[model samples]
Every structure is written in C-alpha cells, then in structure tokens.
Target chain A: TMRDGLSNLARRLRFAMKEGSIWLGEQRMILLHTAALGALRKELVDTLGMERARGLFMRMGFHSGVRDAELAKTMRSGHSDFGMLEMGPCLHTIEGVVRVTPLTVDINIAAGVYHGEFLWEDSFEGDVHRQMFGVAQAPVCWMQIGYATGYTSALMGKTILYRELECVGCGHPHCRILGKPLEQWEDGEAELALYQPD
Target chain B: FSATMRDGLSNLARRLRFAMKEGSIWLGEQRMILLHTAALGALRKELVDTLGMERARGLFMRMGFHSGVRDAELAKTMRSGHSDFGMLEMGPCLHTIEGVVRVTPLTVDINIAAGVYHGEFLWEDSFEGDVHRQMFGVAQAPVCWMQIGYATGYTSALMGKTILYRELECVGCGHPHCRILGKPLEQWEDGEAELALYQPD
Candidate 1:
C-alpha cells in the first residue's frame, strides 16, 4: 500500500544528496563525519553535562525534522492515510542518519494512540556513541529518539513519544525502537521533559 | 550603478537595516561588516599557522590597505552627497563602525596636489591584541596587521600617493595603548621595514 510511497521517497533522497548536500528550504545541511560529530559530542558532554548535551542535540534534530515534516505535508495532502503515515519513515530514511524498517504500526486518531516498532540498521549516532563511550544501560541514539518524536508529533498533529528499547550503543544486537502515545509510556513525561529548558 | 544593481544594493541595504532593527547577528563585498572577535582571532591563528607569522601580517596589512583605499574612494564619491563630510571626520567613524578597531585619526590633511596626506591613529581594544592574549599568550610586537593596512590604504587614497603606516606603540609590545603614524613611504626612519610588507608577493 504505502510501502511503494516510502520506497519512492528513498529514491528521491539518493538524488537530492548525490551532489553531497541536503537542501531543506533555506537550510543547507552538510554531512559531518562520525568522527567529527563524536568529538563535538564528547566536547558538549564534557562542557555542558549529559542532559544538556542530549537536549541540545535532540532539539536540533527535532526542529530539523519538523521542517521536513512541513514539506511532506504540502506534497502528500491528497495522499492516503497509508501514504501519509509512511512519510514519517520516509523522512527518517531521507535524513540518512539511520535505516529504519517498520515492524509494527497501529494508529487511531479518535482514540488518540499511535504505536510503532522499528528496526534500526546502520545507526551512525548509536555506533559513534558505542565507539566513544562503550556500553551503557540507557539508549544513546538521542538524535534518533528526538527525530522520531518530532516526526510523529508533526505528522500525527499530536505529540508522540519514541524511545529505543534496545540500542547497539547499550550492547544490544541492534537498535530496536518503539513509539506510543504520550500517556501510554511508563515515564513519557521524562522524555518530554528534555524538550524544555533546564 | 545600473538600475538593477542599484535596486539589488538597495535590497541588500534594506535587509541590513531590517537585520539591525531585529538585532540580528551581523558581512563584505566592496561593502564592509562586523566580524566576531573570536572568529577574527581564529582566522589570525590559521593564517599565522598556514602562511607563517610574517606573511600573515603582510596578508592582513594588505587586506586592510585595500579596505582603506576603497573607503577613501567611497568618501570621495560620498562628498558630493554630504557637503559637510571631511576625511578627518569620516576617518575614525568607519573603523569604529567596523568594531574591529577603534581609530582616532591623529592627523588629517588631504592635499591631493602635494602628493601627500598625513594621518595617524590612537586606538584601544585592538582586536588583534585581544585575540593574541587569548591565543598565543601575549604578543611581543604590534599584531594589528589589517588595521595597519587600512591606515595605509585610506591615507594613500586620500593623498593620491602610496603611504606607510607604522605602529609607534602597541599593546602587544607592553604599551598601555596602541598608536600608529602615517606618512609618505619615504618619510619614516623605519618606513622601509613596513613598506617591504606592502610589496607584491
């Protein structure tokens, strides 16, 4: 159904980034290598502490994803719910930070719950975190988490929370991400708290 | 300027005005801009590293010299529009607005016929000194290369002859304030020393 739509969007990404810059309106995105990002990440964590750095990076990705979501809205205004829903993952893929495979998705706007499970392959952020800090209990894919939250929040027209249930950074075999309505998660408020200022 | 070019410049000016009105972070062409002190210092370090210290100073001096000439030419063109504007009155204002250096033109006589116009500067918060202290400890000599060039260029343009600006005292040299004197290249005892830096590489 919407699977083809997602595939088409991925194809578009390959074309847009062929010249090695991602253009989203006035913002021109450059790809910084994992090493450089890892160094900056370490610097931020050292200078500002973990929470502050996490919030900064997440908010950066959140605002960035929201801009992309706005573009998606104009393009797919007439498309089906399936096509519309697929835009989230399509956008994630186009961003080129992670490869996401949707495992399960269920949504009901009236009842107010959007749930999805995704298998993350080749997550640059998680791999970089693992290489730098080694293993840890908490998920280290802060950008990905923020991106999913932002993308879903924008597309669904309601806030949605997503977190990595398992991450390679935390010694998992792969990054397995799950999302749900804000109230459904055990401590969704904790994740939401990161969006605000200290 | 052509009508289109004039319109484009007007647009650029309007954008600048709006940005200032909104208090946006502040660029260049034949136009000038405000650069952050830290970023300027970083560039200085990069130039010194890549081009070696002496050449880096030459580079900055050359750049400043160019700006001075351009501004002097601008001042010439601007005279018709502003009947009361003088080289002395306009000289320090330009550098002060640049925010890189605060300049006071110590001497100003634009006698185009005599092939000489003399100007001098006394200034503080030399971006170079501030940056030098932040980076390589403290400087042993005056490090305001661009400012020096600008002084020379402006004087050269104003006088319609080549001029050399020399730092008589510098914060980098443990002086309390920075000072410069400008004259025809042949006028100073050590004019050749600074003149050599103005030579084409």
Candidate 2:
C-alpha cells in the first residue's frame, strides 16, 4: 500500500514536471483519511497526548522480520488458523464507537520506516490506554506499537496489545536513527491505524 | 537522555538477539508459529517498562530496521565465529505481508564489525489483498512493503553494520509474493539496492 502510494507520488511528481503521464488523478492526492489517522492518534493521545505522538513511528525500532521470520514461523506452527482482532477499549459511552487509533509514520528504505526517537511509550500513562499483553492482544501504547498490535490482532478477530519497545542502535537519540538521511526514509508521513473492514 | 537511551538500546539489542540466539522461535505441537516467545516477551516487557513507552516505541522502531541489519551479521557471526562458512555481507532480502507470505520475524537485530555477510536477495512483488483503494487505478498498491524497510533498519543498528534491503520480486498482479530459485546467485552488488552494509571491522 505504501509502496503504491509512493510510486503514485513518484509518477505524480514526474507528471508535475510534465515528464510522465498523470493517471492517479490529481484529485486523489487530496490526502489519506484524517479520521482514519485520527483514530490511531486518539489512542496515542489518550496515553501520551497528541504532541508526543509527533514522531511515534520514529521511536519504533527496527526488528527486520527476516530473522524474526523463523520466530514468527515458530508462532505460526502453533496456531494454524490464527485470526486476530485489533480495537481500542471503550473510553466513552459512544455506544459501539470503537475508536481505532491512526499512526503517522514515514517508511524509508534508508532509515527503516522512522527517523525520530522511534517511540516513547513509557512516557505514557499506563492507566490511559488500558493496555494488554500476550498473543492476539492489542499493544496499549504509542502509535507504532499500536499499529503492530492492532494490525496483528485485528487480523485474528482479537485485540493485540503493545507489549514493549525493544530498540537497538544506541537507544533514543540513536545516531543511526537520527543520523539517517531523508534518502533512507520517507520525508513525509503516513498514518497506521484501524478501521472497520466494511 | 542520549546515554540512557543508548544503554536502553543495548539492552534492547541484547533482548532481541537473545531471543533470536536462544532459538528465536519454537513451533507449537501443531506446528503453529509464534514470535517473541515467552522469554522474548519478558525481555520486551522489561525494555518497555525500563525505557518507558515513549522511549520504547522509538527503540522498537529503530530495532525493527536493525533486525535485518543483524540477520546478515548473524550470517557473518555464524561463519567467522565458527570459521566454517566464510561468507560476506552482500544484502538482505525483504517482502511484504501480501498473499500467504510465510511470516518469519527476522529477529536479527545486531551488527558486528568485520562480520562479512554475502547473500543474494530477491523480492517478488505481488498484491497483498483485494484492492481497497482504486484511486490510483493500479488494481492494488504498487510496492507496498514497509516491513522490508523495517528489516533493513533493525539489522543495521544491532550489528553496527550496514545492510541492504533488496527488492527481489514484484512480477505482476492479482497474486502474492513468490519464490523462484535454482541457479547459485552470483556475487554482485545490488548497485541500486537500498542498504547500509555492516562495517568491516
């Protein structure tokens, strides 16, 4: 999805320069659903506030799933038909309004998705998001973790929870994460969030 | 803040590497796959609780990319440490969660200087699912693979080594990623590949 979005942007860029055909329709460039993004923001805000969510994705560390693939393999080996659900707990009485949090992230091949601090979930209030643990549980924390947990669990019909952050590269101020050039990562942002599969 | 973060990063790296080294994963009786297993989860929790959520998210995001970095490192580490394979770091492979992708946590989040890793990478592009957005009229999103990005970032950090994320396949439409291999991959640079190879210590 992101790649397509980026390639679309690329073609649009060439089109903008009158160097390529513009078929994506300039109108389609308006913007991704803010509400979709807002849902993820609400979750982060509920824990760390909107201000802190600025570079949530930047805080998330890279864990190249390649090596972890075998790990996921082990997990999958146990649960054959694994289906998950990712949704937030009801903080308000808005009936069945399950507020899905949206995550704003920049995925770059250079920096590996985020460039900033990755994420600062510990700075959040534990009581805010009402987080959970274990498999098929939604990670009740910042946006990135929220994205990971939400997406994973949502696929399984169960809420996935943000367990914790396991970063590498000199930690926060990770020179690697920070020092990376824009060429390595997306300069803009995209939101990772949840929504009804309607 | 930077120092604390680094220390936290060290611990984080340890945990992920430990998880990987300590059998990174285990198959359930029925061969169902699971990740960051119990011990790994415990360490992950410790990293979060100690570093704080905000700190943890950033840390994890960083590690996500690092995972790929070190997986290549692991290759070098395995070879040099064992002095058996004698491989060099070439590039890391990446794929998205499209179609029935065999989800395997790269779990490689560590880089070792002088750790040479050599391998060929291929990415077979394919649709992830039913086209949800038709705005672009490309049937499905073109090259939607963030996890590939994550793979490279994680490995780089852990190994303190540069690793490349290669796009091996993106053949066509209405299908998922695929695997096609037969001949031995020749040694060559992914000239246009995206990566930072592990440092040559």
Candidate 3:
C-alpha cells in the first residue's frame, strides 16, 4: 500500500529538489546523507513535532517506496494489505489520525483539482515565534496539500502540479499557502503569492 | 529583595541532620545562597573548559530542568500553580537587567528571560511548579537542567512544600561570554530582536 504511495512521492521529491535551494516551508533544511537520516529525523521530531516529522520521513522515502511495493508483491510478507487496494489515494483514519500518504501525486489531476501544498518547513531568524517558541510544529498544512494532490492525481491519472504559495501579509509559518490546478490558484490569489515569497 | 524569604532554615536543618548522622559533621552557621541558576552556570563553565564539550553536554542533559517539553509553554507552565507571582521577579537585577542593560562586569553576559513574575507563584516541585529555566545554558548551568529544577522547585515553593535547586553536573571554562556574563536583565529579556530594534547596525 505505502509502497506505491511512497514511490509516487519520491519521484516528486527528485523533481522538486533536483538542484536549487528547496525551502521546506521557509527555513532551509540541511538534507543530510542517508546515514544522518535517523538522527535528523529524530531531532526534527523532537523539535518540530511527530506529525511534521512523519511527513518528512515519507518525503524522504519517496524514492525507496517505489520498489518496496513491488517487492512485497512477490514475497507476500503481508496480506493483501501490501497490494494497492486501489490505484489512487491511500487514506485510512484510525482514531483521530488520518494518514493520507499518496500512492500517486496525480490523483488530483483526475479530480480537476491539480496542484496542492508541497511539504515545507521554515527556518527563519532566531526569533521566538520563528521556532514555534520552542514548541513542536506539525507541518499539517503541507501534508494536507500533499494528500489532496496525491489523491486527486491517482483518480485522474494525470500529471498534476501544485504550487506552494507563501502567505502574504503575515509573519507566521502557517502563512504558507498552497493551491493547485488552475482555477483555484487564480481565484484564491495563491497564484500571486507564489511570485512574492511571503 | 534578599529580605523577602528566609528559607535557609530548612536547608540548614537538612544539612545538620545529614552531618550529625555522618559523625564528621562540623556544625556552624553559614550564609545560605540556595544554589539556583547562579551556581549552575558557574559549574557549567568549570566543566566545559576542563572536561570537554561531550562530557559537559552529557552532564548538562542529566541535570536539565525539564525535558520533552514545549519550552514556550514551560515558560508559562512553570508558573501554573503559584501564590506570589513576585518571586519570578526577584532574580538578581544582573539576570533580569541583563535582558535590557549591558553589564560591563567582570564578564560578558548573554542572558535572556523566558518567564518573568514577581514573588507570586513560586513552588517546590518546579516541573509541575512555577519556576522556569533558561533556554540556553549559561557558562555552568545547562539551560534545560536549570529549567527543570527551577520549575520543580518554584512549583514546590508555591504549593508550600519542599524546594529543589539545580545540582551542577559539571563546570564550564568559557571565553568572555564564558564567565556567566551577558547583558543585564532587561536587555536579555528583550532578546536579540529587541536588541536589533535599537539599531541600524
């Protein structure tokens, strides 16, 4: 299940981070080598919060998940639980948590809702609010956007792209605004926010 | 301010009991300075200069005031249960003024304030109590350790129980900013941004 989802995400990761600086939200991240993954992930979890860290983990695994899903098919390590129950958004809400890692980023394309928030983390100047006043930050905004894009794309089976629009006029991390497809971006002014980097 | 609470009696009593039991007890009167963040920072420096960073960091973590906490809230939570919000205001002008004023003292100070109340909310169990710790460690005091102990003690003091002080895990050897000197209390409280506000620099 997550195998296909992860693969879909990893491909997007490579596309998003091919070269130029990729600001997770606003603050830049030091993408460590594979060895540093666990340590950085833990630190991120400690400082940022579990939910945000989980998204970062999935974002990191975009590449690895591509094949793991297929590998599981042959080994049958798990039940049908391993297979793609559907070739679209993988959503299962247990209790209050809603895990929506996308098996495909194009799901939104099918739904005519292309483009969603990209995963982002902001590391600004050493201000109190800049670092959540030492509280954990859950990157829920980006994750939600990520899920939207993944689900819609899967349904449509089209190349869907979302633009992470920075919130204009506010000095908060939540100011990050994302929108995808064409109409919503233009309608909500998220499209304009992109050029300004709020 | 020193005239406010005369609690050294209990500390003295505890020490006396311990000393009498050990037999090598030298009974005498001593001016009690409850080793709070003041002593912790002193020890932090001594530990860092001589022992090394790794050793210093390890010791500091062990003595941390509170861990796995949202520091910003801890700034408030430390005072959740307090009677006199004033004790939070009583730290030496050195620490408080450091937030706003520059102490051209014997050392460079980089102190900041998280929570600032007067004598209203102190307690004994600081973790659940009302004392807050520094975010960054001073020369000797591990920031987190000081926070945990102070929070625990401040809370206890408020609840009318026991009091706890930070036990220095190690000493520190520091540079100019090394010897427990930064800004005055007020200067430190305003933090870097507040400082930046004063300048074109």
Candidate 4:
C-alpha cells in the first residue's frame, strides 16, 4: 500500500552527524531553521516586492521539485505509475514543506495525461507568511505550488501547472490546489511565464 | 580543542529530532526544514542574476547573519558554564552540523571581558563555494560572503561587541580551501566599509 511505501521512503532520510550532512538516498540535504527561512523570505518580499518574490520562490521550488522527481523516478522504477507519482507528495512531506492529502489523482503517463487535486495542510510557507504579514489577499504558497508543478511536469515529461483554489494565506482553513497538464488550463500561459527567469 | 568541539557537536547532533507525521524537524528548540543543495544553488544563482552581485551578496550575508544570531543564542543556552572558547567553538560546530561547511579551527585568542578576540579557521567543502564554482567559474575575489557574515554575527553576539570576519582565502577563488580571519571591528583597517555590507540598501 501507499502508506507502507511512503513509510519505507521516509526511512531513507538519514543523518550523518559526524559528516555534518543529511541525506535522502544520494541527494544531500541541509536543515535550515524555519524562522531563519521566514526572515529570508521577508527580506526577499520587502526587497523585491510581491510579484518578483513570488516568481523567484516558484522557480526555487521548481528546481527542487525537478530534482526530487528525478530521484523518485530512479527510486520507484519498479512501481506502478500511480505509486511513482505518489512519491512526490511523500517526498515533499518528508522534507517538511507541507502535508499533502490527495483528493483525486488521475495519471496516465504513457498517454501523457495527468490531473491531481490535493489538500495541503499546515503549509510552512503559508504559516510563515501569516506570521509575518497576516492573511494575504491571495494564495501565498508560491514555492510549494512550484514544487508540485515542477515535480509533476518532470515526472510526466510534460508541462503541469498547479494552482491554489483555496489557501490558508487567504484565510482558508487549508490550501486546496488543482494540478493538470498545461494545455488543460485556459490561463496556464500566465502561470507558465512566472516560472521563466526574469 | 578540536576533539572537544567534535564531541560537543556530536552531542548536539543527537538532539536533532524529526517528526514525519507532523512534517517537522527540530534541532534543540529551533524548527528546521530540509532543503536540497541544488535548489539552494538555483536560488543563489537567481538572486545573483536578478539583484546583481552586490545586492545578492549583501542579502545572502544578512541571511547568514540572522541565522548566526539565532544559533549563537542556542549555543549560549546549550553550552552554558563552559569556557568561552568552548561556547565559541559551538558556532563552527553548528555550521558544520547545518551542512553549510566543514570548519577546522586553525587558531584562537579570546577574552570576552576585555573585548579582545582573534581567530582563524579553515572552511572545507563549503556549500556556497561549491555551488558558486558550478554556476560560474573560479572568480578573481573571495566569494564566501555568507559564511563570513555568519562568523561575524555569531562571534559578535557571543562577545557582546562588533566582531568582524574576512575571508582571506576562498575556494571560490581557486584556493585549495577557504580560510578566514576574525577580530574586533576596530582592529581592521577600513573595517567600517566591510561592516556596511550588513546594512540594507
């Protein structure tokens, strides 16, 4: 089952204390304080303004997602498509980014079709944003959204965009996001442009 | 000193706690998140490209400074009643444990009450240096801005004075390893110029 598989994956997160590094399989990982990250995010937003900060964070997460997707592909090679796809959320959760609860997932890699709806609980980004500046007018989990988009797109070998339908940053109980292939979203071009380097 | 610091750091590492069900990782009282080095490198590259090297360097330095202050507070609490050297040693130890760099102390002189301090260290396999080299080739100047800021912030906080650090040699500039020198702000010529980098533009 997915639960067991995720547990097995979680166990791979290792701490090499003497070496002063953390690892999830072969990929090196670092532990950063959330408050410190919050400070950096605040600096980015204050320095670059909202729009630029959003795009930068999105791109940041996109790169991370791409890397994790590659790791997932290699690690879950023998698993079913859905199993491999499920690893994205598990990896995200394991990294302390967000808690993902899939509402619906429809994936057909060979046919180049992918759609996923998920509930994101206790988003670290959203929590940090609310702590720093109160509730925002729109969704604030830019990096997590980018991560989902990048991970799915890389795993499926196509463009996938994830949009926040409801968000804790906007006074919602939790974040609700919808992900699908780029062509499926009518306004995906607008979202795609944010992933581009400025 | 290195052996004691190593043992102390290993003990500190034992306190790192992870709660997978809650999606949280904690080191002592500080909450931490695991981030990929590649992702951070991309972020660094983006900052440099978008904000120019000066602004990006300052921002990265300030970021490291903030983290250093927090870690200094943690170190004071974690290693209370130890020698000032032992407490100060925790900064480099924490640096290593955080996966920023591998710190090897070369020399030290400290007198917290007299407000006198001088120190040197070797930083091997620095994340910033490796990332910078991969993104852009070896540069003319030293480029471990953040690590320098962290040392300054950590020491300044611990000593209750404006301690400053300069990277005398850096792997980013084709050095075999990064080497740093630290002292009170007033001790260095043109030190104010270096300190101004921590200020916001």
Candidate 5:
C-alpha cells in the first residue's frame, strides 16, 4: 500500500505543478522558501504574540493532517497495519518540506492504541524560531505536532495528540516529538500545557 | 557519397547513450533536490550569517566538492559496460544529470599524457546565482562558489588529475552569462585564492 501510495503521490506530484505554481486539486499552491518563512515568523510573533501564533499553526496543521488521514484511509484499505501508519513519515519525506526519521512506531489500531516517537530534523519551523526568537524554554514545532496528531488520530479513528519534547529553537541539537492517544498521559492535560505561553 | 564526418560523429555519439529518458530523472538513491534558486540563495545567506563570508564560501565549496567526488565515484559502475570512453565525455554527461549547467568543450588540444582539459559553461542555471544577485545587489566578482567546487571535483575524478575550476564571467556580477575554465590545478597562474577554498573546513 505504501509503495503504491508513494508512486501514487509521485504521479500526483508530476502534474501538481502548472505555470510555475503548485496545485492540489483545485487549490493553487506555492513553494514558500524557508527564508520567507523566517520573515513571516517575525511578523506573526510581533503581531499576535507567540501563544496565539502557536495555536493558529497547530490547528492549521491538525486540519491538514486530518485531510491526509482521510486520503490514507482510502489508499490503505486492506493494506497491512504497519503500512498504514508508516505512510505518514514517507509522505513527509517525499513532500520535501522536512526530513522525519521515525524513532519509535508502536501502534495497534485493532486494540485502540497508538504511540510514535520521531526525530524532526531540518524543521523549517524550528529554524524560523531560531532565526526570529532565540532559544525558548519549550520546543516549537507547533504545526508539525498538530499534523502528526491529526493524521494519526484520523488513521486510528481516535483523537491522538503529539507533543514536541525537544527543538532546535529551544536550543536542542535537533527536534524530537512524541505522540499518544488523546487521554493516555495525565489525561493529556500535561502535554496540552506545553502549548501555553511562557 | 563517402561517409561524412557528421555521420561518423553521430555514430560515435550513438555508441554512447547520449540521449537520456526524454524527461524523467534518475536520482539513484541519495537525498537530493531540484531546489529553487532563491532557497539556495537563502542558504548562502544563512551560511554567511552564521559564519563569516570567507568561511561560508569555504564551507559551501568544500561541501560541493564532496558531492562532486561522490558522483564521480559512482560514474565507474554507471559506465561499466561502455569502453573506449574519454574523460572529456563526462562534461556533457554531467551536464544532463546535474542540470546545473550546459558545458561545452573549449580546448583545441587535450593532451592525455599531460592530463589537461578546457571547457566553457553556458546558461549555468545555478541555484545560488539569482539569489546572490538579489541579496548582494551585484558588484565585483564571480559568486558561484559551489558550482566552482562541483566542476573542480568532478573533473578531478574523471581525468585522474586534480582539476580546479573558477568562474571567468558570472551573472552574479555583470556578465551576460556564466563561464568557467577548467584545467589541472597547477596550470593556473593565479588560482591560489580559489584553491584555498578547496581545503575542507
């Protein structure tokens, strides 16, 4: 299923570009270079404050991941269990937005379980954070965290939340994130607390 | 009619698979990208911002040198079946695979025993060229540091000689197009400054 999905995505990517613009379905897309993202990070934090910005991007990513999960469901029907969950990281790499190496993938969809740990290297978001806001007390891969949560949740048909445990923006060597079912750790309150402002 | 020279040349070209798969690319398994030009420019900026200008150039050039060396090493297995191959063939072949520039052989003489060559690059659609122009606002010298490194490394491997390439005219400055001259490292009279960049950081 992942092999097919990968080639399938590659086929889509083949035609996704038109007249110098990237398109998905009917929506016209554009490649935002990382430097420009750094510029936008400055404006976002300068205007809306960091907490709200984090929330906005996280929610945005959640919806995106949720949509991908829908696509995965169709692409992964009758496929092996590992194939279904593994598609997320592969798709992320093929997308060329970031490089995510899976550190741990513990998921038993049949048993209503899911847990994943990933190293988020070359995070454009964290890079922007470092460029704009110096090392913070917490990790700052808001959208990435949201995306993992939403995509995994949609796959398992349960609300899964992911949290970044380390970030380059937070002065860590690289970025790492952990994910779990919505109510697993401290009823998920502890993880949610990380999203709050300093 | 006797066989025209063009016919002979065409036959030779055909012996080597000169034409590629119309539009498809073969990345071969390394993590690579057809990066946008501006993004490369920004990377240049990041390097310069993080390290100083000279150090950044040194870093990029050396990194590119490594990439070129790897590609050259792979060329052995890739061209295994083909024989009677010359180092000069790597120029146009590298042009197709790298997609960075179109190289044209410029030397009237290529002495195999001497291990020397000359070529000119045209078009040179480098990722850093446009960005350098935009960021630096244009000024004095050639600025395609990594491109220079790639040429040096690739040619070095192909010829079994330490090759060095430097920009003659660059779009980043005021040239209409980019051009580079390649030769054995010792052949150049004034490449000591450029050679310094070849050393690893």
Candidate 6:
C-alpha cells in the first residue's frame, strides 16, 4: 500500500519550468548539489566545530520532520494510524533523502506508546559524510536521525528520539535505526538537549 | 518578444538529470540534492539563533555568493555565442530553475567591457523572503540577504566587475514583492559596507 502511495505521491513532483520553480504538493523544494552541501557541511564543522554543526543539522532535520508531519496529518486524515505513520518514510524516499524499510513498528498514539525500527538504504547524508571524511567512528547520519525524531514526535504529540544503532557511515552494511518515546531511553533528556537551540 | 528567452530557459531545464534509484540529481555537470524549504528555514533559524544575526547573514550571503559564481560559469558555457543580454538572463533563469526565486527583470543597461551596469528587478515568491517572514514576522530593514548576495555574485561574475545589489523592497518587510537594484560597486554610497558582507570574517 505504501508502495502505491509513494508512487502516487512521486507523481506530484511538479517542475514549473516557465515559472522557474519546483514543488511537491504545497511544499516548495530546491535542487542543491550534494558536493555543494558537503562543502557547506565542512565549512560549518571547520568554523563552528563538530558538535555545533551536528546539532544544527539535527535541528534542521527536526524542523523538516515537524513540517512533513503536519502534511501527513492533512493527507491521511482518516487513514489508520499505521498508514498515516508510514507516510513519513514514504515522503522521505520521494524526497530523495533515503530508502526506508520498516523492520518493526508498534504504535498506539492515543495510549502514548510508540516504537519503531527501520533500515535505511542509500542514505544521501551518509554517502556525503563518507565521501568527505571517510568512515566515521560513530553514526554520522545526523539529519536523518533528526528527521525521524522530529516526524514521529510531532505525529505522536510527544518527544520521540531516534538513535542510529548502526550506520553505513560507520562502515556498517547499512544504516539501522530505532525510535521510541523519549522517557523510555535512559539518556533521553541529555539527547533532547542537542535538539534545542543555543 | 521574450519568446526566445523562454525557449532558452526551457532548454536549460531539460538538462536536469535525475537518477532516483541511485538517489542523485544533477543540472548539467553539477550534482544536486532535493531539499524542502521548511528544512532550509529551520537551518536558517538555527544559524541565526546560534551565531547571531550578523554572522548568520554573512554566512548565508557568502554561501549564496559561491553558488551564484558556479551558476555564472555554467551560464557562460551553456549560453556561449549568445548576446550578452541573453547570457545575462540565464543567471536569473537558473536561479528559478534552482528553486531560489522567480526573477522579473524591470530594467537593464550593461556594457561588460566598459564596466557599466545598472539593473533593477522584482523578485516574486522568494524562498528566503517567505521563510524569513514565516519565522520572524516583518523586520525594519530588507531581509533577503542570500538572494541579494546571489544577484551580486552572479552579475559580478558575469560582468567581470564588483557589482552589488541592494534590496530596495522586501517581502519580509511586508512588501508585495521583493525589489532589487544592482550597480557597479563604486557607484553606491555605502558600497564598502555592502561588499564587506560577502567577505569571510
């Protein structure tokens, strides 16, 4: 069903060449060179240090997630919660961010219970990270993790944190991620601080 | 009258290459990634909040300047043998193609060899302006910093002179649309101050 939904959404990509813009539904989109983005990432790291850059990108993704969550609500108003929730990954794929394959998902939004596991294949961010700095010692998919956290948290009306259990940037076969309510994690508060603005 | 200009831009758009299976996109030789405006808005907010407005403005302006320069190079290569005005129009066309803003030329006078340049344009649906307004409401001064930087960078690279743009009116300042005026750097009163924003601190 998600496959069909994604295909449907993919057709929404509109290139208004005469007007000089691109759009996906109500959202405006831009095409930026990956190498250009990589250069910007390097500049951020070099100028602000790694920690700040990582937090900036994560928060960026978080905001993106929140916006998309709103769109998901509108698009899947009467659909089952799982079906609505699945739109996050579907949108991510159509946006050309990464390919997502759900491994385990248990969600009861009204009951305040949520847990999800997904494998990320062909992550654009991870590939950029590896190309720029080689295999990292830790998971380097900051934006993707932020997106997952932001999207689910907004959808569930609570704080949901996603952690990269394995990552292609860390030389894993593929990126693996798990998500749950913030309080469920021992370091939730500490991790949550990273998403806050300075 | 502008039919040829439209055709030229359509040709450029046709070069947009996508490899969805590989998760890659490109315009000509340069690779591109599709990004949402909201995410970019968030990043802009984070930069401003963390680094303060002045630094954030400088960073974004400089970032836009580099992109403008790169696009200028592509314009030269792609629109070679065309009239100077035709080649110049490609900068704005490419900006639209890149999803930055829709540029409407109001007036233009240029002589690259003689180093004379003065241009005016109205920008509709500027990504930077819309995002800034959504985030911070209206402001006292013009707020389309990146777009201004881009115009300057692209035009300067094309003309081989230090051209600068001033946002005379901005959507972020509650205007109907953003308006800009560009001229050779020395022609402006406070050109140095404007040029300094493009320099690395």
Best model per TM-score: 4
Tens-place lDDT per residue, model 4, B52-77, is: 88888898788788778888888888
Summed over model 4, clashes come to: 0
Per-residue lDDT tens digits for candidate 6, residues B41-149, read 8888778777888888888777778778777888888765787778778877888888888887888888887888889987888888888989878878888877887
User: What is the alpha-carbon lDDT for the whole of candidate 2?
Assistant: 0.27
| Angstrom error at residue B4, model 5 | 17
Q: Estimate how well candidate 3 is docked, as a DockQ score.
A: 0.01
Ranking by TM-score: 4, 6, 5, 1, 2, 3
Q: Write the per-residue lDDT of candidate 2 for residues B32-123, one digit (tens) a residue.
A: 11221121233234444544544433433333443333334434443434322122212221122111122222222222555544333333
What is the per-residue lDDT of model 5 for residues B1-201, given as tens digits with 9 covering 90 to 100?
A: 111222323333232221111111223332232233433454455456545688767766765666566555545444544432343455434433343444444442455456756665454444346567786778577887766777777677766778788787888887776777777777888767668877643
Docking quality of model 1: it rates as incorrect
Off by over 4 Å in 3: A1-76, A79-143, A147-198, B1-75, B78-194, B197-201
User: In candidate 6, what are the lDDT values of residues A30-114, reduced to their tens digit?
Assistant: 7766665676677788789888889999998888788778878877756778887888887777777888888989998899889
Worst lDDT window (10 residues) for model 3 chain B?
Answer: B26-35
Which one is best on lDDT?
4
- Supply the global lDDT for candidate 6: 0.82
Fnat, one value per model:
0.00, 0.00, 0.00, 0.58, 0.00, 0.54
- Consecutive 10-residue window with the lowest summed lDDT within model 4 chain B: B1-10
lDDT by residue (tens digit), candidate 2, A1-198: 122222322232111211101112221110111122233344444456443443342132112111222223333332322110101111000101121222332323222332222233222212222322122122333323333433333333233223333321113221110212223434311322221110
